[PDB]
Amino acid sequence: ARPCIPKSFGYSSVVCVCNATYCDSFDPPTFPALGTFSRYESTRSGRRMELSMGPIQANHTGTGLLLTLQPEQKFQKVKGFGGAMTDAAALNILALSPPAQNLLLKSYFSEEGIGYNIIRVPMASCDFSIRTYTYADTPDDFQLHNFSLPEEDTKLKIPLIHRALQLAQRPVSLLASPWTSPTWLKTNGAVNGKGSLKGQPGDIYHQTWARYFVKFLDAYAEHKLQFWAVTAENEPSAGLLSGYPFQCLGFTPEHQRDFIARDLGPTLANSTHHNVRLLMLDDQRLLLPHWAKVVLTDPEAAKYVHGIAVHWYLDFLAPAKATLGETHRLFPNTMLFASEACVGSKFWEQSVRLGSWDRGMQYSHSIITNLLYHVVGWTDWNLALNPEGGPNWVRNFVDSPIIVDITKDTFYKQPMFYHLGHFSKFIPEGSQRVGLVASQKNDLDAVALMHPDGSAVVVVLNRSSKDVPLTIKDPAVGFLETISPGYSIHTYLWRRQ
Numbered sequence: 481a482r483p484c485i486p487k488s489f490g491y492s493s494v495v496c497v498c499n500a501t502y503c504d505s506f507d508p509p510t511f512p513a514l515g516t517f518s519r520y521e522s523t524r525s526g527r528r529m530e531l532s533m534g535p536i537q538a539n540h541t542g543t544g545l546l547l548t549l550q551p552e553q554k555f556q557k558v559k560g561f562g563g564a565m566t567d568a569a570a571l572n573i574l575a576l577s578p579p580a581q582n583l584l585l586k587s588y589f590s591e592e593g594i595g596y597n598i599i600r601v602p603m604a605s606c607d608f609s610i611r612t613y614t615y616a617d618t619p620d621d622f623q624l625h626n627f628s629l630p631e632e633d634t635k636l637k638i639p640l641i642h643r644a645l646q647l648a649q650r651p652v653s654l655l656a657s658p659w660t661s662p663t664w665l666k667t668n669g670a671v672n673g674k675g676s677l678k679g680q681p682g683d684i685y686h687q688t689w690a691r692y693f694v695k696f697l698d699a700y701a702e703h704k705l706q707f708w709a710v711t712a713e714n715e716p717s718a719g720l721l722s723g724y725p726f727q728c729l730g731f732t733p734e735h736q737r738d739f740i741a742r743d744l745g746p747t748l749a750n751s752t753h754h755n756v757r758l759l760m761l762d763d764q765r766l767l768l769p770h771w772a773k774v775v776l777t778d779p780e781a782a783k784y785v786h787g788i789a790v791h792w793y794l795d796f797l798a799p800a801k802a803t804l805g806e807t808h809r810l811f812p813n814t815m816l817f818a819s820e821a822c823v824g825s826k827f828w829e830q831s832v833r834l835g836s837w838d839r840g841m842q843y844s845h846s847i848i849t850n851l852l853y854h855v856v857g858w859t860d861w862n863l864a865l866n867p868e869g870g871p872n873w874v875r876n877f878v879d880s881p882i883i884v885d886i887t888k889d890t891f892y893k894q895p896m897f898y899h900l901g902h903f904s905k906f907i908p909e910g911s912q913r914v915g916l917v918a919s920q921k922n923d924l925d926a927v928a929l930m931h932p933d934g935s936a937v938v939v940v941l942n943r944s945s946k947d948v949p950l951t952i953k954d955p956a957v958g959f960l961e962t963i964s965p966g967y968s969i970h971t972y973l974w975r976r977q
């Protein structure tokens with residue numbers, strides 16, 4: 481129904497302004513009739529997921545560029561898209577007025593929004609927190625009698641999480657990850673700094689750390705929230721670095737391997753939560769394939785790991801083929817999942833850039849590259865941040881698809897938000913990536929998938945300044961003549977007979 485209200489802040493494109501009385505929204509989703517394709521277009525010049533429709537044609541002639549769908553060439557099935565309800569997300573969101581708060585959650589979780597079906601929940605406090613705490617701060621409580629949830633959980637996250645679920649018609653999957661244990665389980669006795677669990681997998685400390693995961697799920701189950709999956713540790717390599725500035729817990733791969741095999745997996749297997757999946761790694765892609773090689777070649781650990789979670793810092797370059805591609809090759813049955821993405825992490829960089837097309841382009845290119853290397857899911861970091869990229873208790877600010885302006889009761893939908901929605905809205909859970917062949921060398925980036933119901937979705941990204949005319953062929957159905965303007969992203973949808 482409602483278009484974008486664009487404001488500029490002096491970066492390359494615009495944000496969409498939402499408040500207590502107005503937000504950009506889509507109508508209830510329909511597909512076009514057979515013979516007709518839908519095209520959603522966003523541009524640096526200002527367009528924001530503007531729907532257009534075109535005929536699907538029987539013949540095509542040209543020398544021009546041709547993308548030909550390979551609908552019977554099938555890759556991964558997609559789990560979904562989401563972001564993280566961190567403390568700071570929660571705080572930003574609840575600092576808005578009920579109406580603005582509600583249009584923000586609509587924005588992400590509703591079919592008038594961009595159809596998120598994943599929420600990552602930090603287990604207690606991380607850097608995007610204002611207190612340091614765990615659920616079990618009383619020292620030497622090995623049986624976790626004094627384990628409990630504080631208000632960060634019971635008043636901010638859990639209520640917002642239930643609200644996001646009410647708005648979504650898609651089933652929504654929660655993912656948990658802890659940053660640190662209680663300090664009294666750690667070699668260095670602090671939430672941060674170099675250090676890991678004391679003792680050895682199998683022992684009291686390790687069994688207590690694994691019983692903490694069960695208490696965590698037990699406690700969220702009291703509030704009627706079930707988890708789809710947990711990671712074994714957020715960025716386990718962080719806790720191995722001297723000076724590490726915020727909450728962390730260090731594992732070598734050998735250590736994570738043993739802890740999964742002897743403690744966490746078994747502990748989880750013998751709880752009511754045996755159906756929660758366990759994801760390993762939950763760190764940067766350059767740790768692959770070596771980490772998977774260490775963990776998944778051990779059969780006692782291997783039988784507990786459902787997938788491998790990877791982190792993307794889009795500020796930084798790293799190979800995709802030699803890491804994700806190699807890991808898929810060695811371990812094709814284990815799924816790959818992107819649990820965290822973020823832009824603007826570099827201290828020297830403006831944390832929040834209101835209107836950056838470039839950072840939107842970065843989000844899309846990453847999702848595409850992820851999809852091309854067999855990853856089944858992509859999860860953004862903080863759902864909402866302030867205009868500083870906070871709050872963050874060690875001043876570790878970063879960008880977010882949504883920026884809250886509490887003083888004006890306003891929030892701003894960045895280009896990022898739309899780049900991500902070009903995927904999240906139009907690829908439901910159980911979609912399968914299919915193949916896509918380009919007839920010639922070209923500057924586009926593209927991905928094609930098939931809906932559970934057999935409908936086609938292709939997203940095309942133009943990072944170049946030039947308007948590339950092109951054609952998409954569906955062998956069964958016909959041709960789509962179109963164009964990919966410089967600095968644009970499009971998503972195409974159609975029914976297949």
Ligand SMILES: *[C@@H]1O[C@H](CO)[C@@H](O[C@@H]2O[C@H](CO)[C@@H](O)[C@H](O)[C@H]2NC(C)=O)[C@H](O)[C@H]1NC(C)=O
Nearest residue numbers: 482485486497498499500501502503888889890
């Ligand atoms: C929320 O934002 C909308 C859009 O910016 C505001 O409505 C606009 O108000 C200005 C000034 O009266 C007019 O130029 C426009 O005609 C209005 N646009 C629309 C779409 O109604 C609205 O006043 C803002 N609300 C609050 C509470 O701040």
Ligand SMILES: Cc1cccc(C)c1OC[C@H](C)N
Nearest residue numbers: 916917918922923924925926
């Ligand atoms: C747009 C496109 C679609 C399918 C296959 C290829 C290789 C392709 O080009 C990617 C290349 C980076 N420009």
Ligand SMILES: [K+]
Nearest residue numbers: 615616627628
């Ligand atoms: K407690």
Ligand SMILES: [K+]
Nearest residue numbers: 824825826831
């Ligand atoms: K920064």
